[PDB]
């Protein structure tokens, strides 16, 4: 609810890569809250957006993106080339208990470290 | 690549809930591979589907669903009432290195256990 500085410890392919974040207000147009890394130039922002909906059903949406850049010869600032979009949506109903929601949550949280997905992401060979 | 029995250990709101899976072939229409729990009745299947695409960009899609049921008075078999859909899509480019993909992967994998998301899922109060 009352969000603060989320910092994740030691993630990314191995070992020693921490990740700090800061809140960046609430977008009142649709309720999306934003989290961002204190980068050097604000066009290079590791950003994580979360949201929730209201009724039908529910649309809990987490949309994470983190572009990278390169000092291309021809511009003053460094410039973005590629994106790294990722998004995940959760759909529930009015009558779902606490157990089902927690089950789906940590099931996805544990299944994202299974070797099936690390093959299917870092080398993209399917099943 | 060569997929086998994925079983996750001790997930869901607390403690003692394991989860076995089995492969269920490859759907040749679009390449989607399926994983499923050996349930009693095959209409109640904890299922996880994975896929990948080919070019533009990439569309690595993980679509997980697990209905629950109740013995409603009026039918022989138990019947499904609600769903618990969840899906997550990853979009990359041709020029993304290994580092960015692994970073986005385990960043989402660690961020799904942050207290922000457990509030926003199990009690749905936003930021």
């Amino acid at each position: 609810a009352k969000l603060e500085t989320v910092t994740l410890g030691n993630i990314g392919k191995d070992g020693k890569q921490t990740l700090v974040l800061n809140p960046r207000g609430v977008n009142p147009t649709n309720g999306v809250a934003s989290l961002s890394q204190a980068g050097a130039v604000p066009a290079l922002e590791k950003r994580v957006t979360v949201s929730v909906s209201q009724p039908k059903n529910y649309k809990v949406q987490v949309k994470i993106q983190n572009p990278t850049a390169c000092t291309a010869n021809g511009s003053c600032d460094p410039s973005v080339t590629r994106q790294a979009y990722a998004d995940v949506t959760f759909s529930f109903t009015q009558y779902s208990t606490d157990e089902e929601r927690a089950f789906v949550r940590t099931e996805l949280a544990a299944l994202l470290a299974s070797p099936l997905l690390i093959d299917a992401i870092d080398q993209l060979n399917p099943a | 690549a060569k997929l086998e029995t994925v079983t996750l250990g001790n997930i869901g709101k607390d403690g003692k809930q394991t989860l076995v899976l089995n492969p269920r072939g490859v759907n040749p229409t679009n390449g989607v591979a399926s994983l499923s729990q050996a349930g009693a009745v095959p209409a109640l299947e904890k299922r996880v589907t994975v896929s990948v695409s080919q070019p533009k960009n990439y569309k690595v899609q993980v679509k997980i669903q697990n209905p629950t049921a109740c013995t409603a008075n009026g039918s022989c078999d138990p019947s499904v009432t609600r769903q618990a859909y969840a899906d997550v899509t990853f979009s990359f480019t041709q020029y993304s290195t290994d580092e960015e993909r692994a970073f986005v992967r385990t960043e989402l994998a660690a961020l799904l256990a942050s207290p922000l998301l457990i509030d926003a899922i199990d009690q749905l109060n936003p930021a």
Epitope: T7, N10, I11, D14, V20, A109 | N10, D14, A109
Partner: antibody, heavy 109, light 90 residues
Framework: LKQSGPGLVQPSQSLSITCTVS????????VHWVRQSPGKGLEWLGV???????DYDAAFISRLSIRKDNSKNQVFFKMNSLQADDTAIYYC????????????????? | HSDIVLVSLGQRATISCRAS??????????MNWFQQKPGQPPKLLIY???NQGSGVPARFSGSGSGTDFSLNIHPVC?????????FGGG
């Protein structure tokens, strides 16, 4: 948490300890190991977490193999050539990789 | 790197360390506190140097910035955490 391992071993051999966990899920946490002797208070946190196999204590690289599993939560480790003056009691711990402001989960043995 | 530290009305333990260990945006002071009973593993005291450990009574607290820490327990082991979490006793 649970704890089971053979004790009172003759010196200059290997020595292994297993541990399970029945609380959290081992994927998004970490396991810590300390010794406690009558000589010193308690010692290193050369440990592993997240599934990423990681660092050790600086003095004891020459020993201390470590493994992490997900079959059911086995975090069993071993020691090669147990020197005879390594007389202590070994303790395991949990750790959360989840800094959130300052309220942050930590050290339930 | 290492550090050194030492019926009513309370007393307190002091501290001395080299690095102030201020790695992040003010959730920084990773200094901790431990007391143990003999037949038990050591229960967790206040973590992050001022933040009222999980399941502790309210009479325990700590305060102070980096390399300057304190206790206050007036009605009635130390460790630091930068990279290898080495420390000593008291």
């Amino acid at each position: 948490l649970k704890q089971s391992g053979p004790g009172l071993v003759q010196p200059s051999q290997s020595l292994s300890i297993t541990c399970t966990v029945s609380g959290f899920s081992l994927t998004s946490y970490g396991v810590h190991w300390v010794r406690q002797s009558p000589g010193k208070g308690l010692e290193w946190l050369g440990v592993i977490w997240s599934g990423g196999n990681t660092d050790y204590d600086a003095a004891f690289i020459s020993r201390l193999s470590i493994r992490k599993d997900n079959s059911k939560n086995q975090v069993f480790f071993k020691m090669n050539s147990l020197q005879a003056d390594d007389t202590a009691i070994y303790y395991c711990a949990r750790e959360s990789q989840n800094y959130y402001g300052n309220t942050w989960n930590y050290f339930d043995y | 790197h290492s550090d050194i530290v030492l019926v009513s009305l309370g007393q307190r333990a002091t501290i001395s360390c080299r690095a102030s260990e201020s790695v992040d945006n003010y959730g920084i002071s990773f200094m901790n506190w431990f007391q143990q009973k003999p037949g038990q593993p050591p229960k967790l005291l206040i973590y992050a140097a001022s933040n009222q450990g999980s399941g502790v009574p309210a009479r325990f607290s700590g305060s102070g910035s980096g390399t300057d820490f304190s206790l206050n327990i007036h009605p009635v082991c130390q460790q630091s955490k930068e990279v290898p979490y080495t420390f000593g006793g008291g």
